[PDB]
Design a protein around this ligand. Structure first.
Ligand SMILES: Nc1nc2c(ncn2[C@@H]2O[C@H](COP(=O)(O)OP(=O)(O)OP(=O)(O)O)[C@@H](O)[C@H]2O)c(=O)[nH]1
Ligand SMILES: Nc1nc2c(ncn2[C@@H]2O[C@H](COP(=O)(O)OP(=O)(O)OP(=O)(O)O)[C@@H](O)[C@H]2O)c(=O)[nH]1
Ligand SMILES: Nc1nc2c(ncn2[C@@H]2O[C@H](COP(=O)(O)OP(=O)(O)O)[C@@H](O)[C@H]2O)c(=O)[nH]1
Ligand SMILES: Nc1nc2c(ncn2[C@@H]2O[C@H](COP(=O)(O)OP(=O)(O)O)[C@@H](O)[C@H]2O)c(=O)[nH]1
Ligand SMILES: [Mg+2]
Lengths: 420, 427, 124, 428, 419
């Protein structure tokens, strides 16, 4: 019925901007203005993502947060830059640090209010506000660090509404800080406590996708952000299109999350880069085609939601889907009955005549947490860079508290590869 | 005498929406309410000209009821009798029954009561709602409680839409079904279940609709529903008033659930074909493929039967037809009954929505039977339900709206007791 | 068959009758409870008013951390500011005596000439 | 944001003198200051036309700073930012830190603070000073104390010149080194040591200079120093803020000391030869003969790595290069890290002082690594220091400026503790 | 940065004058005027030794002290006589005596003030005053006696600044006072207490150099003062030239003196009379070529400073030096690490295309003290000429006090042939 969008920190904003300029072409919005395109559907659920302003004008419902100007002026002077309302931006000025503690405590809580102040006047301006979705990196500081605090402060101002996050769980290959595992473990803890759904996007996965299966030699944050934007627009469609099944954000949550803790959806996409239906389904349901680095073989599905795209004879679609979970019957858990719903929407994405995307609440995700946690205990063991956080005011055992909380989460995902 | 329809929540609204349109078509009432006792049992002659339905439409989101006040039939109902609640029930009985339910139930009941005020001998209510889904299960349950408080004797007939996987949203559907059917049970009088799978299946074998709409399913249900009320809308023996349903169909306060089986479902375009004999359509009634809760009654036993014929028909035929159904079929009546067949004939032929999927027919039947086979649909649910609950699967969403975990325990405890009851009526 | 259709009722637009075919063969809804519908609001109005007072907890920790780094950077200064200014009044105090102990050494060997020249004017 | 350089005492001054000249050559700034954010991190646009460096130059004798205000670059700095103190430090930390230091430290700190005032988000200081020698060790120590008082968070990076016998004056050098490195330690954030022997040795093997100048050594250091600042002078990939730059290198508050290894040092006159591959210069980094503190890191362990490429370069290469460095070499990473290699690329090619000794290169590297091998340079000192102090060798010159004999004891006590620390980061 | 020059007593003035007219030709100064020479370097550090007066004129920063006119008028009516400012001279008038006591107490302290009055107005006229250097004999009276008092009075007026002395430790051969050992021991005591460096110049050495290795039959104070002037200009160069290392005087001190007491540098020179680099280094590092009579075999080096002279390929110089202290490795003490620095300055001395000079803090110096002290206890044993001093007001046990203080100094140099 109406969701606001917080988009915080460098990775957050870079993802966010590309996401925005992707859906604004799906919906058909000018750099500044409104509609130009011979389609009709679009505008029905434009309510959801665009708080529409004076004149024609559409203006996305977005809060842009960063703890230093650089990557925001990037966005303004670029793609669909003129689209977001001026004082919906929040410059940090200071150091971001690539240090969770800084973003969550010192240099963060400095801003926080000024952010909340805009999330308030956007949210307090909704007819019936659904909730919030935030995008951000999980390693590093301004996004991962202030973000978790932002969401910690939103639930409380809106216990009430549900909480969404595209979060980029980070990797050794393609990364820029020894400390990322610290920053990530610290957040993964927070996420477990304060969200209702989190779409786990592995930069490890992404990279692989471009070089494992795309011939892309040097993966920028460019031709790798692209995959996320596509994944994000797929994942959302039903929040923003015809909309009967799932699509309601709480409805998505009530259906995707059996257990309060386990909301870690690993996403997956159709064809790739910058197609027949069967092949579309055998691809969207492939290890080699997930957005989180973990083969959903070593681990079963709690719930799946799949969403197809393009004028296509869906007589074949349920038929296909049904087959998937018979061929591969053992990897869908027996004790949650009709646990893999599908939906179709006939307006294609950019280029592509046909596409599909899949949200999976899978215990294979366990695989990702373990690896960021094995990195983490590898450092904290003889206390590595910890001093950067100790000094920012943090407590020794609070790192021990996060690790331990997140170790439980592995031990639960495991627990629910159970039995009837 | 009178008779109030209450439609709660999308499924119910839309089923309703599609049979008031058929009631209108049957009684010559134009969408504006105009028409140039009898059908007075269902419509009230408000002011001079109009003919507004005795109905209340309640949903907790706007959306669906909003569509009603937008497209012709817009002027059929009175603005008040359409009630909407801003926020959803978000697919869980707890929210429906307790959390968002609370707020709107005082307005609904208070409005239903305005229709009750109009009625010189109100006869009872017909509640239309989904089994799965949020407000359908949740808000109905609470309504039915408070109805049983506010209207003592007055009967309550329900049309439940029993969930089926193919045409269905929520994973937690079974919980909501079992949850309500429990709370609702000692408050309903007779309840007509509709298996969405059956109604979808009839659309596929019979109408050849490759993958049916809701509006596809709905029009069919409209017909089965019309066929039931018909009796109380035209007046002519056999279920002429709510009480008789209970009288004829239910032998034990529990065991509410009659199996509906509708006669010729034959796709318009076939219309100009040879018309089917009174014998041929009677025979249709004893064919599972034509049922309406998918189960199998050459398996359980019949403890009540009730053929309701519509259109031009003479008893000499219905009698002579029933003869050969017995001979070349499965009688199968329980121990302690007659071998019933209460026959009802309504000379007024069946009508059909003119743009619709099925053709104009000469004569139809309805065969309502209280068979112990329905019990199968009660297991297919309980099995799902058990198998999730055994792990608390989604329980925390209910506990979250302030529901007791033991309230799941206790509802399933009842669903066992029912499945027990139903099997204990054999031999 | 052995029909016996006992016709219960003929009508203006109808006709009922029953065909008994074969012998049988044998022989407080309570208002009370919404002290349950507001007792379930008791469960929520509470367990939501907790995951809120476990949040006024998480907050009284930001207030704790944010002012520790300041309380212990404040600590660095007014410890290791005066760790120096009292390590410079050890130097100044030290060398001053080293120069003035090297003079009271030196004047003492010049008050020697004054006490051995006076040795000439008394031994001629 | 901003960034103040402080050069203290001859060595420090002259090293500075020789990389501000290089900064100027890099950013197209003519000696008079005029040039026809970005490099704003280091230069302030003063008045209309000029481009003065964010720097202070302090020596306790005139002489060196005097030469700066005499020969072009004369007009680069502002007259005030160059401070001089009339009397020497006479080659002893005690004089430097206490006796003559006292007098000038109030003027220095108060002037540095004027530069601090013109900085909308000052980020930290870069101190350049000798290890041996008087004001270099002595006055620096006192500066760094008082800086840690006057600027709380603000980082402090130091470029130390670790003394080597052949190009060195004083016998009491070791005392001064150990004396300062102790007092300075809990006040620095990360410190880049420069072994004068290595810098001299590179000039001999590589440039073929029979017996190098200070200005010979200096130009080389200038390059290594530019390569480090580079990252945060233009805007180049990562190492991109002074916190984040070092958040990379130092795992423990002590262990400050990264080992710098500079890429192609190839003598002008060889300029027109075949240009060296991205793989070939990467490989140079893992060759001790090319290091910058004479030690041996196929011996100790790595706890941090950090390749900083300069010039035209694509990651596809640096990655593919790193591969074969692992295969036919000594990985050797401690127990509890990744196997790092933070890679930074700066497309802006390396410049060289036109009359200088080294040629214009296509692509250079910088490989900064926190290896436990550096500890070797901490012993080679401590050994000297012990072996004199065991006899009070020159101690009386310090006691003479009013220094406690136990302050020697205690500094050596720390150098032991450090040598201990560094060895205790091996195996688990 | 600026040193003044006290030059007191006959041997003091004779050495001093020749020293002055040697560096004024190195720097290029007229008898009165200033610059005439096509070199350019010179004048950079002329600041150090020449307080420059009105007009062009350079005038050396010198105080000329004596306790009787004779040997001063010698200097005025001679070489570069017209160079020193008039009232920078201090005539004694009275007896010098060849008696330490007289110069240090009676007839000395008579003057002292008048001297200090000029050292003041020279020193209180420096930009940043380095320190003082005094030249004088150690045996005999006006130089040896008043001098030690002068320095005893300077430190006190300038505790602060550092203290330099070329002192000529005297010999039986070439001398005519029986009392020299008394006069020497009495001063050697004083030196130990009030200097920061002393360059020990043995007249014994000097003599030998001219007759042991120079064929010079009759050594004057002439062709023997010559060796001192050459040695002294050598020793100073860095104080007055390019400015690589040492050059600071305090810096020279902090580098040359491990222990507060042992500041007795024994000097040595390149070629001689009035050359290849190796040969230059094998000569400058030779017993037969030291300025103090004591072979630096019997005794090790605490610190060496060596300084080379002339446009010469110094690739060979450190190379050479390095070899010296390897081929002769055992005689450099192990416990002071890089204990022999070297420097080069490319402006040659008079004549000579190439030269070198070496300052060595050596425990071989112990050898010299012992011999002047063996002479001393030889007399004082049965109290010889002592009555000359007793009478001048001195105390008996003050002689015993000096002997004993200086015997310790032998016992310390010995002590530091250690491990
Ligand atoms: N036959 C039929 N079934 C329907 C229709 N609409 C929904 N359903 C079914 O009803 C169930 C969902 O019930 P809903 O009415 O949507 O639940 P609700 O909370 O009452 O409605 P909302 O307020 O929109 O949440 C599922 O089992 C669907 O299969 C319909 O129009 N016809
Ligand atoms: N690399 C390099 N090292 C130098 C330079 N100048 C002096 N050094 C070294 O610095 C040490 C002595 O420190 P200095 O800077 O000369 O002395 P200072 O106290 O800082 O300055 P002064 O007032 O002249 O005494 C020795 O180890 C020298 O090798 C130089 O220009 N470049
Ligand atoms: N998908 C993608 N990942 C990014 C991008 N930028 C940074 N990351 C990842 O996020 C982590 C650090 O995030 P960063 O944005 O620097 O943290 P911030 O200071 O909060 O903005 C690293 O592991 C990166 O791999 C981006 O542009 N796209
Ligand atoms: N090198 C050198 N030694 C001298 C000279 N004149 C005297 N001496 C030595 O110094 C001692 C006495 O010195 P003298 O200057 O006459 O004492 P004075 O009374 O202080 O002037 C004797 O032992 C001489 O060997 C001289 O001109 N050159
Ligand atoms: Mg110095």
């Amino acid at each position: 019925r109406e969701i606001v969008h917080i988009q915080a920190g460098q990775c957050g904003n870079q993802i966010g901007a590309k996401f925005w300029e992707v859906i604004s072409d799906e919906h058909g919005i000018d750099p500044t203005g409104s509609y130009h395109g011979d389609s009709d559907l679009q505008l029905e659920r434009i309510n959801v993502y665009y708080n529409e302003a004076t004149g024609n004008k559409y203006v996305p419902r977005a809060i842009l947060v960063d703890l230093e100007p650089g990557t925001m002026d990037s966005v303004r002077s670029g793609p669909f830059g003129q689209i977001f309302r001026p004082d919906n931006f929040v410059f940090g000025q200071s150091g971001a640090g690539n240090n969770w503690a800084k973003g969550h405590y010192t240099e963060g809580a400095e801003l926080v209010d000024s952010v909340l102040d805009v999330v308030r006047k956007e949210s307090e301006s909704c007819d019936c506000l659904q909730g919030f979705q935030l995008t951000h990196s999980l390693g590093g500081g301004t996004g991962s660090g202030m973000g978790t605090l932002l969401i910690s402060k939103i639930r409380e101002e809106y216990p009430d509404r549900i909480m969404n996050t595209f979060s980029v769980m980070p990797s050794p290959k393609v990364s820029d800080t020894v400390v990322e595992p610290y920053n990530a473990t610290l957040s993964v803890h927070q996420l477990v406590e304060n969200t209702d759904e989190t779409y786990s996007i592995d930069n490890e996965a992404l990279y692989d996708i471009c070089f494992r299966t795309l011939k892309l030699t040097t993966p920028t944050y460019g031709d790798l952000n692209h995959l996320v934007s596509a994944t994000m627009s797929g994942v959302t469609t039903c929040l923003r299109f015809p909309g009967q099944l799932n699509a309601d954000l709480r409805k998505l949550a009530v259906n995707m999350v059996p257990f309060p803790r386990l909301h870690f959806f690993m996403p997956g996409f159709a064809p790739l880069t910058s197609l027949t239906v069967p092949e579309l389904t055998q691809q969207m349901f492939d290890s080699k085609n997930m957005m989180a680095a973990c083969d959903p073989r070593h681990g079963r599905y709690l719930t799946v939601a799949a969403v197809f795209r393009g004028r296509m004879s869906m007589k074949e679609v349920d038929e296909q889907m049904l087959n998937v979970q018979n061929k591969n019957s053992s990897y869908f858990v027996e004790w949650i009955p009709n646990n893999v719903k599908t939906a179709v929407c006939d307006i294609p994405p950019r280029g592509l005549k046909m596409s599909a995307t899949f949200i999976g609440n899978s215990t294979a995700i366990q695989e990702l947490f373990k690896r960021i946690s094995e990195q983490f205990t590898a450092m904290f063991r003889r206390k590595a860079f910890l001093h950067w956080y100790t000094g920012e005011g943090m407590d020794e055992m609070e790192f021990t508290e996060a690790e331990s909380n997140m170790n439980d989460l592995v031990s639960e995902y495991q627990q629910y590869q159970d039995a009837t | 005498r009178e008779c109030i329809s209450i439609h709660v929540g999308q499924a119910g609204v839309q089923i309703g929406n599609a049979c008031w349109e058929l009631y209108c078509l049957e009684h010559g009432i134009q969408p504006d309410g105009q028409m140039p006792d009898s059908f007075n049992t269902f419509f009230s002659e408000t002011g001079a000209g109009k003919h507004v339905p005795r109905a209340v439409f309640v949903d907790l989101e706007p959306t669906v009821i909003d569509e009603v006040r937008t497209g012709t039939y817009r002027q059929l109902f009175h603005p008040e009798q359409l009630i909407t609640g801003k926020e959803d029930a978000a697919n869980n009985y707890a929210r429906g029954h307790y959390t968002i339910g609370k707020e709107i139930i005082d307005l609904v009941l208070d409005r239903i009561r305005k229709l009750a005020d109009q009625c010189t001998g109100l006869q009872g209510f017909l509640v239309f709602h989904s089994f799965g889904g949020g407000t359908g299960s949740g808000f109905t349950s609470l309504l039915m409680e408070r109805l049983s408080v506010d209207y003592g004797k007055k009967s309550k007939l329900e049309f439940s839409i029993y969930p089926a996987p193919q045409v269905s949203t929520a994973v937690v559907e079974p919980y909501n079904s079992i949850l309500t059917t429990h709370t609702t049970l000692e408050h309903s009088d007779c309840a007509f279940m509709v298996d969405n799978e059956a109604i979808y299946d009839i659309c596929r074998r019979n109408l050849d609709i490759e993958r049916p709409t809701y509006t596809n399913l709905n029009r069919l249900i409209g017909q089965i529903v019309s066929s039931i009320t018909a009796s109380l809308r035209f007046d002519g023996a056999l279920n002429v008033d709510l009480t008789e349903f209970q009288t004829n169909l239910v032998p034990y306060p529990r065991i509410h659930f009659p199996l509906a089986t509708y006669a010729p479902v034959i796709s318009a375009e076939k219309a100009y074909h040879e018309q089917l004999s009174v014998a041929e359509i009677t025979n249709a009634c004893f064919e599972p493929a034509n049922q309406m809760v998918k189960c199998d009654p050459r398996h359980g036993k019949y403890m009540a039967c009730c053929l309701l014929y519509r259109g031009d028909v003479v008893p000499k035929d219905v009698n002579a037809a029933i003869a050969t159904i017995k001979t070349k079929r499965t009688i199968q009546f329980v121990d302690w009954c007659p071998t019933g067949f209460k026959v009802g004939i309504n000379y007024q032929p069946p009508t059909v929505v003119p743009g619709g999927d099925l053709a104009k027919v000469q004569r139809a039947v309805c065969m309502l039977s209280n068979t112990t086979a329905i019990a199968e649909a009660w297991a297919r649910l309980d099995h799902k339900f058990d198998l999730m609950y055994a792990k608390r699967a989604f329980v925390h969403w209910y506990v979250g709206e302030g529901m007791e975990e033991g309230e799941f325990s206790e509802a399933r405890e009842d669903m066992a007791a029912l499945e027990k009851d139903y099997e204990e009526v054999g031999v | 068959a052995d029909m016996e259709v006992i016709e219960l009722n003929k009508c203006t637009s109808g006709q009922s009758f029953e065909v008994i075919l074969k012998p049988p063969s044998f022989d407080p809804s309570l208002e009370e409870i919404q002290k349950k519908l507001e007792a379930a609001e008791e469960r929520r109005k509470y367990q939501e008013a907790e995951l809120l007072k476990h949040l006024a907890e998480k907050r009284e920790h930001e207030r704790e951390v944010i002012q520790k780094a300041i309380e212990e950077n404040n600590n660095f200064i007014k410890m290791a500011k005066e760790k120096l200014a009292q390590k410079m009044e050890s130097n100044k105090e030290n060398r001053e005596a080293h120069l003035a102990a090297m003079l009271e050494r030196l004047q003492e060997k010049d008050k020697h000439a004054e006490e051995v020249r006076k040795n000439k004017e008394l031994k001629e």
